[PDB]
Structure 1
Amino acid sequence: RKRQAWLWEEDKNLRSGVRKYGEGNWSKILLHYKFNNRTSVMLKDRWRTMKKL
């Protein structure tokens, strides 16, 4: 438990995808890269979190 987190591939997918596609096109991200349980809000949130570190 402690604190849940995403896996290496999922993080890599988001970072590698969003950076080249756009910070507001989660639909396309989900289309190409596979995820565990993402939709749009999750992708957006986590990306912003990563950006601000």
Structure 2
Amino acid sequence: EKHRARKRQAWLWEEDKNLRSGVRKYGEGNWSKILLHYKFNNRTSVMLKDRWRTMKKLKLISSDSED
């Protein structure tokens, strides 16, 4: 709805940070906790899961290389 146009909009800077810090602070696979701890604009456990999975797999977070 909050776009009133085709193609889903991307995630917000603040939300990505919230999620990143959330997973780092409380671990992965606890979207409910993350969602409650950090103040997201309009997200759900499903959107958090989607975003993180897509990010770690395709938007290669990295910063954990052996060398």
Q: Shorter-chain-normalised TM-score: which range?
A: 0.7 to 0.9
Higher helix share: 1
Larger radius of gyration: 2
**For this pair of structures, how many residues does the alignment match?**
52
Structure 1: stretches of 5+ with no match in the other structure: none
Structure 1 residue ranges (4+ consecutive) displaced by more than 6 angstroms after TM superposition: none
RMSD between superposed Cα atoms in Å: 1.6
Could you tell me the TM-score, scaled by structure 1's length?
0.80
Of structures 1 and 2, the one scoring higher in RCO (CA 8 A, sep 6+) is: 1
Structure 2: stretches of 5+ with no match in the other structure: 1-5, 58-67
Report sequence identity in percent.
Answer: 100
